[PDB]
Design a protein around this ligand. Structure first.
Ligand SMILES: Cc1nn(C)c2c1-c1cnc(N)c(c1)O[C@H](C)c1cc(F)ccc1C(=O)N(C)C2
Length: 294
């Protein structure tokens, strides 16, 4: 059984909390898409259940074990909790905090203000989501963990309603690297030194967070509209940057452009990003700005 080290502490599969299979009940599917299905479950404690296909390779098995180790060793309010695992019966389960709000990309798209729902979302809701994820990112940064795929699709919401809390919910890219192809690399979220030299640092996630910020304030649009992966690669490498999302306040767009500085040394760390998000949330001219109604 492979070892995992986080914050200089070493853990093993034996450290995972094995929940007896009999204590676990599947309720409904939440989707499969990527390798494996996800179900809502009960252990009563309500959970999301990530499953490993019984028809898988040994590498799929190792990948599954590693993501279990990675998530269980985090302890922060803006990272999804692992309730435990069921690895001793098949198919194997990882048990996660149930985030009833679903993933952030789907949420933004579904919760866009509309003539039917004219006040579904406000600038403050978006700033709160941004702060939440930035807090999670700061925790990773201070513990020297590089996420490598900070993106709306990988964030989750505790609930649809106003008290929602956003958390980082998927660590599959970091898992792969820790141990694929060009076409699968999240190039639209990556800085120049990442896709060119394969150099990753904390400032890798800063750049990606800027793209997430654009996703958030665009209300769920795909980054670099109308651009392919290679077109984005050449655009960004040549200094090109995304325009502000529709109705985006200047102070918010300015955080994006700072996250996208070419030199990683010129990009803010997450402490600074959090400070700027805070300042935006205080600014009436920012939060009084109306989001577009489709
Ligand atoms: C209720 C619900 N509805 N939807 C649409 C989803 C959920 C949901 C709720 N809580 C938890 N923990 C998960 C999913 O976790 C999985 C692993 C997961 C994690 C990340 F980051 C992204 C997508 C994702 C996923 O696979 N979804 C299907 C998203």
């Amino acid at each position: 059984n492979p070892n995992y080290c986080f914050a200089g502490k070493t853990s093993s599969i034996s450290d995972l909390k094995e929940v007896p299979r009999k204590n676990i009940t599947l309720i409904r599917g939440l989707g499969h898409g990527a390798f494996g299905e996800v179900y809502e479950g009960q252990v009563p404690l309500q959970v999301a259940v990530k499953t490993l296909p019984e028809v898988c390779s040994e590498q799929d098995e190792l990948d599954f074990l590693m993501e279990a180790l990675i998530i269980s060793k985090f302890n922060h309010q803006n990272i999804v909790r692992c309730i435990g695992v069921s690895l001793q019966s098949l198919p194997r389960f990882i048990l996660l905090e149930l985030m009833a709000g679903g993933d952030l990309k789907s949420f933004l798209r579904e919760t866009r203000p509309r003539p039917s729902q004219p006040s579904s979302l406000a600038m403050l809701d978006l700033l709160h989501v941004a702060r939440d994820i930035a807090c999670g990112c700061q925790y990773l940064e201070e513990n020297h963990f590089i996420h490598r795929d900070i993106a709306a699709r990988n964030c989750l919401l505790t609930c649809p309603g106003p008290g929602r809390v956003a958390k980082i919910g998927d660590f599959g890219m970091a898992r792969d690297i820790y141990r694929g192809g060009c076409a699968m690399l999240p190039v639209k979220w990556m800085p120049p030194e990442a896709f060119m030299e394969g150099i990753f640092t904390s400032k890798t996630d800063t750049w990606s967070f800027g793209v997430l910020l654009w996703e958030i304030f665009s209300l769920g649009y795909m980054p670099y509209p109308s651009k392919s992966n290679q077109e984005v690669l050449e655009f960004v490498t040549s200094g090109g940057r995304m325009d502000p999302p529709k109705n985006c306040p200047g102070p918010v767009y300015r955080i994006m452009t700072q996250c996208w500085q070419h030199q990683p040394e010129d990009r803010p760390n997450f402490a600074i990003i959090l400070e700027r998000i805070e300042y935006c949330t205080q600014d009436p001219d920012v939060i009084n700005t109306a989001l577009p109604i489709e």
